[PDB]
């Protein structure tokens, strides 16, 4: 009957520090989840959970409000599970991403910042009328059902 698609942007910035920290952290980085352009995903996003590498203290980082982001320093890239939880009461209650937080991009001088963007399109089949309105308030659109 109804299919709603909405877009999320997942990304990160990393840059070599001008001097490593006392712990040996060589890079500063920031990972985020956000709407495209003008789109406010807080209409349908309850919270975003970033699962950091267990070298980091309290590695389950939660943002219940924008900005959905984590900013840290470190010495190596790692795989970061990210959960985007929705303001809905039916499945899917969340979407699980596995984000590659890398500190080096070949072709980029390490002194220069790196920026990576991942554009993810979410598809919701037969959402509740409430959730449909939240999705559309966040830039979602209805498309050919299924």
């Amino acid at each position: 009957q109804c299919t709603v698609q909405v877009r999320l942007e997942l990304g990160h910035r990393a840059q070599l520090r001008k001097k490593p920290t006392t712990e040996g952290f060589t890079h500063d980085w920031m990972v985020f989840v956000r709407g495209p352009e003008q789109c406010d995903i807080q209409h349908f996003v309850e919270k975003v959970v970033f699962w950091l590498h267990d070298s980091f203290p309290k590695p389950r980082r939660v943002c219940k409000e924008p900005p959905y982001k984590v900013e840290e320093s470190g010495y190596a890239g790692f795989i970061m599970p990210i959960e985007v939880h929705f303001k809905n009461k039916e499945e899917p209650r969340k979407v699980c991403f596995t984000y590659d937080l890398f500190l080096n991009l070949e072709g980029n001088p390490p002194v220069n910042p790196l920026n990576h963007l991942r554009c993810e399109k979410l598809t919701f089949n037969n959402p509740t009328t409430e959730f449909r309105y939240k999705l559309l308030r966040a830039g979602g659109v209805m498309v050919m059902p299924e």
Partner: peptide
């Protein structure tokens, strides 16, 4: 690259 350095990965963990």
């Amino acid at each position: 690259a350095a990965r963990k």
